[PDB]
Paper text:
Nylon hydrolase ([name]) is one of the three enzymes responsible for the endo-type degradation of the by-products of nylon-6 manufacture (cyclic and linear oligomers of 6-aminohexanoate (Ahx) with a degree of polymerization greater than three) and various aliphatic nylons (e.g., nylon-6 and nylon-66). However, the post-translational autocleavage of the nascent polypeptide between Asn266 and Thr267 generates an active enzyme with an α subunit (27 kDa) and a β subunit (9 kDa). Based on the X-ray-crystallographic structure of NylCA, we reported that four αβ heterodimers (molecules A-D) form a doughnut-shaped quaternary structure. In addition, we proposed that the nucleophilic N-terminal residue Thr267 in the β subunit functions as a catalytic residue for either autocleavage (from precursor to active enzyme) or substrate hydrolysis.
However, the D2 symmetry was partly altered by mutations at position 122. Plotting the protein stability (Tm value) estimated from the CD analyses against the distance between the two monomer molecules revealed that the protein stability exhibited an inverse correlation with the a2/a1 ratio (index of symmetry). In wild-type NylCp2, Lys159-NH3+ (located on helix α2 in molecule A) was 2.87 Å away from Glu115-Oε1− (located on helix α1 in molecule D). In contrast, the distance was reduced to 2.65 Å in the thermostable Gly122 enzyme. Notably, this distance decreased with an almost linear correlation with increasing thermostability in the wild-type and mutant enzymes.
Author numbering:
A (entry chain A), B (entry chain A): 15 to 28, 31 to 259, 267 to 355
C (entry chain B), D (entry chain B): 19 to 260, 267 to 355
Write the structure that this text describes.
Amino acid sequence: GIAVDPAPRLAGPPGGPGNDAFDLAPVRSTGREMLRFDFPGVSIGAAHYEEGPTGATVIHIPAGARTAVDARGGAVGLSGGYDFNHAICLAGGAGYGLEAGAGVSGALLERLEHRTGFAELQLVSSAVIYDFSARSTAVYPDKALGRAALEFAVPGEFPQGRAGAGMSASAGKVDWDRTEITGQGAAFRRLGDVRILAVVVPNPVGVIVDRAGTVVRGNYDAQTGVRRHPVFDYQEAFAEQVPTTISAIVTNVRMSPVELNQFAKQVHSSMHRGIQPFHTDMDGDTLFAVTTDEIDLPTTPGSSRGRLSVNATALGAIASEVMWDAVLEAGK
Amino acid sequence: GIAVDPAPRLAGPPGGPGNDAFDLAPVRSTGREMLRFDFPGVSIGAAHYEEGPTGATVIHIPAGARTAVDARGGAVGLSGGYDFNHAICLAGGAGYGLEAGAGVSGALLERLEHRTGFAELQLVSSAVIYDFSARSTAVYPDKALGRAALEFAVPGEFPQGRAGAGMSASAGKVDWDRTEITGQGAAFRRLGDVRILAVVVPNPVGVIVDRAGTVVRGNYDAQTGVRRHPVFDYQEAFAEQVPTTISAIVTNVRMSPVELNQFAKQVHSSMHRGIQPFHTDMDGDTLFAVTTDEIDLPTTPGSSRGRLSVNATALGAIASEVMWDAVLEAGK
Amino acid sequence: DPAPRLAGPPVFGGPGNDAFDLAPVRSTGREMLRFDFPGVSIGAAHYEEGPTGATVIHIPAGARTAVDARGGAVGLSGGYDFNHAICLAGGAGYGLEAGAGVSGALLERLEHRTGFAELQLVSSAVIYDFSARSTAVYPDKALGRAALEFAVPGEFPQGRAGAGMSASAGKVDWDRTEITGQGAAFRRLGDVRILAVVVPNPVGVIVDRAGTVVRGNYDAQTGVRRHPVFDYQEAFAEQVPPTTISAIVTNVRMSPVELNQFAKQVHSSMHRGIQPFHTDMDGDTLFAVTTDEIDLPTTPGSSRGRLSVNATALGAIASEVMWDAVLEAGK
Amino acid sequence: DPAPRLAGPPVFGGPGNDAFDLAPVRSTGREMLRFDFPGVSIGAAHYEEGPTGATVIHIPAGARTAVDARGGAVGLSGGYDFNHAICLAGGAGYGLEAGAGVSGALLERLEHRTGFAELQLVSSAVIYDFSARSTAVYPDKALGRAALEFAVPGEFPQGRAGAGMSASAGKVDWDRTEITGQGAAFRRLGDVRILAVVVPNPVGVIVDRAGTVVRGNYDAQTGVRRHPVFDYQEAFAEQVPPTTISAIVTNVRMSPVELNQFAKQVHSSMHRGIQPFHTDMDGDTLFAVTTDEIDLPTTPGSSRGRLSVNATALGAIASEVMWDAVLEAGK
Ligand SMILES: [Cl-]
Ligand SMILES: [Cl-]
Ligand SMILES: [Cl-]
Ligand SMILES: [Cl-]
């Protein structure tokens, strides 16, 4: 059970200098703690500019992996969106921060010795959060930051908390006076040979909610010292006036394109448990579902626990709980 | 707080005669209780065949209303899917049960005196659940049943429980030995002049879960007398072997097509709180978001409860809680 | 240029299904196309009282399907990724009932078995053909049942037959709209089979490969058909300021991604023979169906070129089979 | 038939961006199109070292946009429903970097303000143009910045210019692929303005309105271009068994649903001038952009017909402006 910290992390009231105002040196992000996991073939790197503060987080899978993209929000900021990726790049800096993905792409082209055959094309999908209201600069994750995240990527490690894309992520935006800093978060599970890793950068309009139904991050009211569910503010506002989260889930279980896409949708929708409201017009919510195609499900779905108990739906259910864990690490 | 009944309603272990084996007479469904609400312009009718047992539930809005359709599942059964509807028809009988919608359509053409100008076209969207494993007949909602639901429709009333499309709906299908009968369910809220009505026929692969996180319908294990979360069965199955919900939300608040579509997605995803897992490959999950375009939101979204507190996202949040209530009435 | 078939002014006011004792007629159209495609049957039925009809493609074994619903006024039921039949019909929204007739009849043939892997799946799409006649009659359950019962292997009745009974083209102004028809074409290449079925009811006109307008937007004042774009641009100079439903069925194995992209390609290709097309006023809908009997080779090469045997290539061949079908429809 | 411009065999092995001191060149192409469209600017820049380039449409006030991404190999960034610029580029995936250069330069012009309603939005799409040259050079940040800086109102450099520097057509076999170009066209009708920009790098060929293949799939053995479908069907007889990126910019107000359906229509219409099109091998992507300055009348009638002034009608006019653009590209 994740020990979330009850103390407030109000982001504060929302120009400022841009990138070239500074001599920007990428910092390898360590965050508050390192998650360690065992998943050969998948590396994660995180880098930030302290001058933002803002960052990027890169998932490198050099073999390339089949990918489904679930771009559910109404304000999505997305590059590539490919159904096969060598890397995924998550970044702050809103639409400007997609540039970090170009830094990754360029650097992978260089590792391939600038080979450009169709089958050699290095494919990176990027998505962004708007993290500018959480700080007083206009610094964004650029080319050099994306390359540095890629260079910093190591297998079996993830920096929890204020790190990479999560450096100035924040939640709960009915009013900015009640918005709190979140983080990024990851969690991982091995069942048999099955491996599931979840990565998340929740910058939601809504709030982070734990399995008991407590609001644990975002919409902190300084006048009461309490975090209410946004619906309460929304209903009072209506009674008076009338009259983004970016994520990845990576598994080693083979799924067809159709399965993987429905998997993506299932795990994504499940995140409305831990973030509320979710998939709003104001959110750019995007989830990447990625399989390394290492392990087959059985032909038939049966087990002592039910006829319909082993299949891609079952794995979605299990992966959804890994994701919830990741959202809670980010809000911790 | 909805007093769900803890007693089990196991559906039982899953041919049988079809429609014409019987002299099928539509029954006006009354269910276990009538919800009463005030929403001029929207009528609901429910009819069933006792011989199924199976039913249909029809939302008649004779003025016609702008509609967004969120067909999220992997096994959707849908007819029309129109962005403007005179009626919505929900039915059992799987794909065969879309015929009820044709019964509605034909009967509306007759009220219009068979006028067929472009602007006079009567538009009905239909969606279905597969409810055949809950009974031992092959009877399905037909033309005559849809017409009878339409004829039975009255304003300001909804039959809760085993009624209309919810007559043989059931939940929790990791194994059919643990599947329970659900129902249909509705709930309604008036804030100021704003009216929100929710209607739901949850026939999920997953289970119905209340606001405290208790599983309250589906995946009842007769050997333990308890309902576990499906994830527990799924994880045990994996450790061992390796190595549909149809709904409507109707409001009187004007929304543009773009808003209404994102509204649909938001409220739909929120239902993964009350049904888990949701939006799976095995589900045909479909939500209809409908506005009668009677009341404007304010131009600006501000209030004493926050700068971003009155808008279509806020209304999604409020409508999501009306929907949860409706899912709980269905599982009650 | 062919003789005109102007629809004439729409005479709304007329009797609907309940006013008649409606008798299904097996459509024979103007001529029969004969082809060899084992496991595919086609049945066509109409009511003279409309006149209006439905055309059903029956594939008993069931076949994977991709759906490209492109217009802004689509009228579609099911849209399944696996189908035992496809139902095309007039009657606008109301003709979606014909498909329920097919679904019901198939269930009876399956002796009312209902296990999740035995459900009989029918996708249906419709055209609005009310303006081309003076009744409110639409293809109902019984007419869908009749078309399935009338289905035989390797025949297709061309012209005013089934769903093509009252299809029409060229709707810049109703005074220049012409009756079309339904149309089919078939090509076999080694073991590769491609059947194209089409029911054009376009806002636009049918155009042949020389760029001639061959059906729709015929001006009785001048004796000549015009491309709609000439009417449109003149309309704009003056005032500012002052559906097609189709199936492509083949026996080549394609993955769901491949078949989907193939459906999109062939569908777009039809803007060569119908113009304009995929408009907000159309409900254009194409079903791509494969019986999954023949493999494409593992690599795409041949004496005709390195990227010459693949799904895009089939796309291109099928696009011509489809253009032939549209032209039969308009003939 | 025009003289051939065969690309020649792809000579992979060559130097990339880091091997050069890359100097942006303002593209002038083969000739300048001049037009009058207040509030729209176009800038084009290339590196000779590729050769490869980027073309940027700048709309300072920002404009509503619909995106139709149709191919099975799309390479797209942003895809926003509101844009201050559109960036088209070679370099395949890698050329999406040019758009980040534009985004960065716009931010500087906005003095680094970052409120949610002042974000500078750039959508970018790319073609793979590596096979048409012998280097790995791609349009980078600086090249995107250069094209935005080079932007002026009412000019468009036709031909090998900007993103069209190494665009090519006709990819049944690389030995028959021909260099294309980029192309634009402009039509004004009363106050109604329509600009069409296109960068065809199709697997298919460019075809004119008479149905002639005018660029791509040229056989040096015979001196003649072929429609790909002839190669494909012969390939199949033998062996079984044995991208275009574009913008349509107008000043007419359309609702988001209207503009979207309009984008889809115009995009499909391009299967008349490029064949095949919307294939799984293409990343075909079209941006429909409106400056929202002129209203369509409330009802659609005119002396040219009852349904003659509306968004479908604009669709049809814009489809011809676009075909002119493709032909300029291939010229
Ligand atoms: Cl576990
Ligand atoms: Cl309330
Ligand atoms: Cl049969
Ligand atoms: Cl500017």
